[PDB]
Symmetry: D2
């Protein structure tokens, strides 16, 4: 799946709809990022710029100008074509091909932006700019506005009003279109196939990073070159570290391994966590913790629908967690009192859910304590976990156990669709899968 | 292989040896680098900081203080231990364990650097600082020196002399120790195994990125998680782009594919290029260009030794290239005149060799036109290539052909050692390998 | 005369009237300014901050918060009291006395502004800030807004809208109240007494700076310690330089001297120019140029009234100038054609009038080519001049003559009031004054 | 008196003498400084730039290049000539006239400094730069050094060593030449004539600022347009504030007035303090404090010579002060014990002496607690004072009395020369002077 030309057009128009007449919105591309010396990390476009363009070059600026309710036009600034630069570092779109390729009305050289931008902002009332996002963008915008302020004898005027467009754009990004949902659905399948593969390949004596290698290879072969975040493979006590990315340890028979990994497919994030036995068989103690996390997930999956919230579903999970932990002797006391004291927090210290999209921890207003009412089109994770520290004052058998199980869902009219259920999570299904792989 | 504790100690002492008495050298860690929103790229330590420490954390500063010819000591600034931060993002060394772990005399909290650094620089004559390397480092250093300048009533004095240590340190990095050569030898083997694998896996109808996926998986399984640079897989006309990294095209029967890829193993770069037929059989036209590049490489490999230079060996390659091209009718005229006119440049527009080490394009003075005399311990690439543009005014059969063949070598007492010869480059050996893989 | 407490209150309320509900306006004091090393120039408060406060300290910020149409309050940030700092450098208002002294509701320590400002802006929709005015102010404001943006888990929100209040405030400053007009009236008298004195003291063999000394002494004795701008005393050819401030030359019998000087009284600028003979007697050639400039001024003074403009009155002056210059043989041709060609520009190359107030070249929109229609309450200068370069291709007797005559006026309901007519400008009155002084 | 062309030449050569071979010293002019809006404070040249040039323009850079022990040359960057800019704002030196006028070998346009400076620094080993002095200078220098670092393929190299020249230059400035001493001698006379005049003009009912007006007029008429610092006229309790510059109060019969004021003559500072009765007659209580301060000054004047120090002479003053204060009942106890407890500090809380020159508080190393041994050519102030707070717990008659008496001296071979003794300080001579003036 992919995002159509028409969809990028619709998004631009949906932003323009919300803009004041006599205004311009300025959306800047991400800068190139150094890895070491003259070498750079693989380019990752700014998510908001990407959202309006699907264009993967640096040194580009989308300018949307609204004259009134029925009159608007777009200007792109982008890199000029340069045979020497293109022989060395790769092909560029240029100005001639840009209007047709990206559906903009006009394309200018980025090298001329300081000569041109003030002319576009001259006489407008409002400029929409995400101030503080990038230093290079702020220099450009401020420089343009100073030219206009100081240029009254050349009959120039600056817009006196500057508005951060991020609240508006992130509110748009919070609600996925059918096209976006289709892309995220594929990202979920890709990510699930990778997690299945990691389970099937895992053996004692392999390193954590070996499973990372399997996962990234699987992402790549479906056309997701990059992960959406740094892959986490925490075996044993490493599972109690939420974003453990060292992935350096030999995986030991008897330990669990926690894998949090997600592909980036057409800009969109998958985000799955599966925890399983390194040797393919859960111990009793491991099952006892696993079952609590699985019940939390399965119950959350049932409950999530329009009209509830992350906060409200979290309350049900806290109850399941505190109850399970009291039965195992990990907590002691009255369940309701323990809940009132948030006695689960030493063992579950993060949120159940986050928004998901062009960023793995996606943009959009959560409301106080993530109390915002859910509506169709919102996409989020469901990731309960229990992390018992190596030195927790609890029965010995639970110490050093970290388990998270995470699915990705989209809120529908009547409930939710699970995008990541094609990778198993019931312990008997995990064991069967691993057994079948070891034979083969 | 790896770098020993003792080696890191030797390097620090070799820097201190060259420093003036009453001086301090300040070496800063790389900052963390954003990929998108709150997500960050996998951390890559600054090569110079790494060279003296093997320490892979941000927010760290190595301070080497030389009192005189026989008196010096070291201070590390590094992140304090923080249970919440460590539960979330991973374990930290801290101050208690640092002296023993990294062989420094003293370790302080990085959060106290502004309270502490001026005290360390107070009364010294010279400070060694790589000004302009990092903005955060410059703020810290300048702030310390201002405190000292303005603090004469508190009996403070600033060192009046600031010296860039990079020339000195990069000159050290230019000459590899036996330990470094052993590590680079392993990086070369790992990288070669990956290139062999790409050749064996290649089929028509696969995408360029599929071969990238194979290569990265191979790097990872030998314990090189990351490439040293963004992998290049240019099939067909994409081969004429030197750092083509889009890797997005379906590979076509009849085309060549050029793969430039290198692992990062213990900080050190492999860097191999192999070009081969997608369908496993070179055409006549492809062989005719390939043979010229292979002769250039084989001849360069024979010639490289102490006492020659990149410039001098390049002159021999230019002759081979111009001669081969005249015989094919790609160039026309007298060979010596064509050489004098640099008539090869449209087809070979980069350098034959670059330094290799902790950076793929490694530090160290080349001399004018890379004329510096080679000595034992220098490590460099040997990468002739010919790139015939799709629209070159040459016989049709050569258009759109890009071929590079690149090996990594270390200059020895009597010649060089080739680190990357375990992956084949003779066309008959390439074909045999691919045939054997297709059977299977 | 002075500005009352009530007037400062009215101005604040007039700004708040124009502000959106759920907004805050931030007005910053001027920074202290270095003259050399640890010594500083006499403090000059920012004109806009002064306009709302009459408060002459640095490190102060006026915050006006509008909740709705009937609810607003003010917060001052200012320097805390400090006995050591006050023994050394002078008394401070502090927080306790500020509410009563400056009629603000609340006063906080400026040293706590970063801990406090974000709390004041939290949850507002709009912030009024003159971005780019001062770097220290921008750091403070941006820092506050970043705290709010990043603090959603602490239930913080930033105002998305930032508005430059300068257009609004400068439009207010453009129209003087009766109190302001009374103060400017006194500034005009003070400045006129100083110019009279300079005429009476002038003798051949005195230096240009001696007349500056007389002028500044006169300003000071009426309680205007500082000039509103750097005093200009251009004798001879120095008169052809518009802002000649070297004032270094011996004044010569036979030359004219041009004095442009103005006091600063309660923040408000006087601005007078008088040109007169060093020896107290105009030559024929000097009179011939002087009379043209005087007619231009006298005619402009008659014409200026509500409904005309600087542009329109300038057109009448250009006609007077071109006509006078043609009669002297300084210009040649048809008067109307010469006017159409702007043939006066080599000799009159600046504007006839500028706004006058808290700045000598005062704030306020002029309109294209200063075409804005004049209304009662606007205060402006009237300063025609003719400057014949030493090397002009004109009759010898006019070369090196610079003459400007400048008055300050306030537009009234029926015309204008001249604030600076208490110093003579008719040549016979100038001569009589100088004669009487020499006896002284 | 003035500084000769030859002297500026000698100073440049004295700096070059101390520089390493293969080096360049960069000395930048002061930036122009805003007073309000588009108006600027009278230009004050940077003291170090002035010291080497006597050149009073902004946007100028002196570059001194030392090839070896017998080969050096100079390059000036300065503003280009511009008829429009010169008609408006004043004449400029330009490039053609600069070599002859300022004795430099070469003059280039300041607008070309970024195109030219890196070429001058290319291939040098050392650059002398006062980093942090001016932000505009740092941008220029850093930009040049980055061009050189990154330009190795254009055969460019940056000097690796940067040295702050300020310690060296300020050590030069600490020792005045005969020419400088002659200029400072005239500054002292001018300043003394101004203080005499203030005493003669003072009457009850005049304001503090009126005496400022007299002082500045006197400075100006001898050709010292500007004061070296903001003039202090503290009558009554205002005398207990060390740098009281409000000068806003009506001077009252019965009070003392403390005047600290100094001219700037050819860049050099006068610095005199005299305290005297507003009504021309010291009271008993006023005499009792005055006599202690006068004895401190007279004794210090006798003691100051080569081989002593500010610290050592201060110890004698502390003894005089503590003894006088015990006799008046302002202090209580054993004199030696009171001295050991620094019991004088509430009443004398500043230093006895500071260096004097191109800055009023002049450059140069003082040593710990101003213990540096004095040598011929050092110029310094001698300014004991006693400041009894309005609320001091001392006999009523001493409360609110601030007295300082300050002279300027130059250390000679056998003692010192007093530059400011032409204004009276003995109380009977003060009274006689004021009596004679009142008749006026
Ligand atoms: C950053 C957040 C939106 C998500 C994170 N996993 C948390 O629960 O805290
Ligand atoms: C950057 C250089 C050292 C290497 C690069 N391949 C070139 O030949 O230009
Ligand atoms: C800056 C302007 C408002 C005034 C100036 N005298 C001019 O006529 O150009
Ligand atoms: C700044 C110092 C050199 C001088 C000042 N009067 C003091 O005694 O503290
Ligand atoms: O961040 C957030 C979730 C918590 C576990 C890992 N990712
Ligand atoms: O850079 C440099 C070499 C040229 C080909 C790719 N890498
Ligand atoms: O500026 C402006 C006017 C022109 C002459 C001097 N002041
Ligand atoms: O500063 C210093 C001295 C102390 C009194 C005023 N000037
Ligand atoms: Mg266990
Ligand atoms: Mg072909
Ligand atoms: Mg004449
Ligand atoms: Mg008294
Ligand atoms: Mn996850
Ligand atoms: Mn997640
Ligand atoms: Mn390569
Ligand atoms: Mn290479
Ligand atoms: Mn004027
Ligand atoms: Mn004017
Ligand atoms: Mn003084
Ligand atoms: Mn002094
Ligand atoms: Zn996460
Ligand atoms: Zn390369
Ligand atoms: Zn002006
Ligand atoms: Zn002082």
């Amino acid at each position: 799946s992919e995002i159509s030309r028409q969809e990028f057009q619709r998004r631009r128009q949906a932003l323009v709809e919300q803009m004041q007449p006599g205004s311009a919105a300025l959306i800047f591309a991400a800068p190139e990022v150094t890895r070491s010396a003259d070498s750079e990390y693989p380019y990752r476009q700014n998510s908001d710029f990407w959202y309006f363009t699907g264009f993967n070059e640096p040194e580009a600026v989308l300018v949307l100008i609204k004259s009134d309710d029925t009159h608007n036009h777009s200007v792109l600034f982008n890199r000029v074509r340069d045979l020497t630069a293109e022989i060395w570092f790769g092909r560029r779109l240029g100005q001639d091909a840009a209007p047709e390729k990206l559906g903009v009305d006009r394309a200018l050289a980025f090298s001329e932006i300081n000569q041109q931008l003030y002319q576009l902002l001259n006489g407008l009332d409002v400029v929409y700019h995400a101030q503080g996002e990038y230093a290079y963008a702020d220099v450009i915008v401020n420089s343009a506005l100073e030219k206009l302020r100081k240029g009254s004898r050349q009959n120039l005027t600056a817009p006196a009003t500057m508005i951060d467009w991020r609240p508006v754009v992130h509110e748009m990004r919070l609600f996925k279109s059918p096209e976006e949902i289709a892309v995220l659905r594929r990202a979920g399948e890709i990510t699930a196939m990778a997690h299945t593969r990691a389970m099937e390949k895992c053996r004692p004596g392999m390193f954590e990073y070996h499973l990372e290698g399997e996962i990234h290879h699987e992402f790549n072969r479906h056309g997701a070159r990059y992960p959406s975040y740094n892959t986490i493979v925490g075996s044993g006590e490493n599972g109690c570290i939420l974003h453990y990315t060292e992935n350096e340890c030999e995986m030991r028979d008897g330990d669990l391994v926690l894998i949090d990994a997600g592909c980036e497919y057409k800009g969109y994030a998958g985000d799955i966590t599966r925890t399983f036995p390194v040797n393919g068989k859960f111990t009793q103690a491991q099952r006892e913790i696993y079952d609590i996390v699985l019940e939390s997930l399965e119950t959350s999956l049932r409950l999530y629908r329009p009209g509830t919230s992350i906060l409200e579903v979290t309350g049900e999970v806290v109850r399941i967690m505190v109850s399970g932990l009291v039965k195992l002797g990990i907590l002691k006391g009255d369940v309701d009192e323990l809940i009132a004291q948030n006695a689960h927090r030493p063992f579950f210290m993060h949120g159940l859910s986050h928004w998901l999209g062009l960023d793995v921890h996606d943009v959009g207003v959560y409301g106080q304590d993530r109390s915002r009412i859910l509506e169709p089109g919102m996409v989020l994770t469901v990731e309960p976990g229990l992390y018992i520290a190596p030195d927790a004052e609890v029965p010995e058998q639970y110490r050093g156990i970290g388990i998270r199980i995470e699915d990705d869902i989209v809120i529908t009219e009547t409930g939710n669709e699970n995008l990541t259920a094609s990778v198993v999570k019931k312990p008997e299904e995990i064991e069967a899968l691993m057994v079948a792989a070891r034979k083969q």
